[model samples]
Target: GYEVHHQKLVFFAEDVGSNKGAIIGLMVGGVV
Candidate 1:
């Protein structure tokens, strides 16, 4: 079974695509 957090990410990935998610990830990664 998928972990709860994994499902949340999967849901978002489906919303747009890895491209959008990658942008968000870059922003988030830069924050840390």
Candidate 2:
């Protein structure tokens, strides 16, 4: 559970790379 949360947070923060913010949001949204 904590691992998933960590990954999700990382993905969200990582959107700084290419504006792929929405992609991470979608992925994390479904993972939960």
Candidate 3:
């Protein structure tokens, strides 16, 4: 048998003349 796991991540952009913001969507990953 194998074990599996999920993780979530977020990305943001800055120094574009405005405050920091989230330009990228959520990211998911799996491990075994």
Candidate 4:
């Protein structure tokens, strides 16, 4: 059960990181 919860947390962090990265990339691209 702990392992499963840890995996979910990592997955959620990665998903949010990817989205945040994409948004930052777009904003930078627009400015340039």
Candidate 5:
């Protein structure tokens, strides 16, 4: 999901609810 002025990215990982997963959010710099 994203917008012109603001943006967001997300990713999720799971191992069958084995208490092993990572929900991550990331952002990027316009200059980077």
Candidate 6:
């Protein structure tokens, strides 16, 4: 899905490739 990959890129960039960390950040961010 385009959205999934887009989110991944954003997360990876934010986390500097820390996939697990990015995932956490993304999920937590969605809680707001």
Number of the top TM-score candidate: 5
Q: Per-residue CA lDDT of candidate 2, range 1-32, in tens?
A: 35543333333333346754353334445554
- Output the TM-score of candidate 4: 0.11
lDDT of 3 at 6: 100
* lDDT score, candidate 1: 0.43
Query: Candidate 4 — which pairs collide?
Result: none
Query: In candidate 2, which residue pairs clash?
Result: none
lDDT of 4 by residue, 1-32 (tens): 35543333333343533443354434444553
TM-score of each: 0.14, 0.11, 0.29, 0.11, 0.30, 0.12
lDDT of 1 at 20: 42
- Candidate number with the higher TM-score (4 or 6): 6
RMSD of each: 10.3, 9.0, 7.5, 15.1, 8.7, 11.0
Best by lDDT: 3
lDDT of each: 0.43, 0.43, 0.79, 0.42, 0.75, 0.41
Tens digit per residue, CA lDDT, model 5, 1-32? 67568679999975675665668799987883
Q: What is the lDDT of residue 24 in candidate 2?
A: 32
TM-score, cand. 6 vs. native: 0.12
Clashes of each: 0, 0, 0, 0, 0, 0
Alpha carbon lDDT of residue 12, candidate 1? 38
Cα shift from native, residue 15, model 2 (Å): 0.8
